[PDB]
């Protein structure tokens with residue numbers, strides 16, 4: 090039992106900047122710093138914004154702050170801690186049945202407001218700062234107005250679906266594809282987050 094390894098923390102490595110007129114990705118930590126922070130769980134970098142780019146040793150994806158919780162997908166984070174200025178922080182929400190986890194939102198982040206608009210005209214934010222129009226098609230599904238290869242959506246699980254007013258409608262979970270083309274997306278609705286809380 091002496092030689093058993095511990096899994097590393099999820100690390101914030103950047104963010105999707107939605108502040109101004111143009112959305113763009115920003116990197117805040119390179120691979121070497123990410124690997125070290127994952128092992129120690131100590132991340133002293135200042136955190137800003139609503140959508141974080143996160144990484145483990147083996148995967149990279151997104152995490153989104155809604156209502157003071159940084160939310161992401163279980164298939165990316167598993168049960169891992171997240172790195173913080175004072176060490177690894179345990180998940181406050183874990184739900185494998187929803188493909189959902191969450192931690193307390195980091196100091197300095199900004200939280201999205203849960204949408205109460207009832208609008209079906211949505212916008213998916215990807216890790217490459219693409220803002221993709223999506224028509225809501227059900228409680229947990231939306232169709233892309235312009236389909237595209239699934240490669241463009243890989244790595245964007247945990248990102249937000251937003252309403253026209255910039256409220257959070259859901260967390261991107263899975264892509265619905267035909268012959269490698271993404272025609273629709275599946276997401277965790279914000280109401281399911283609000284219930285989990």
Ligand SMILES: [Zn+2]
Nearest residue numbers: 204206252256
């Ligand atoms: Zn709204």
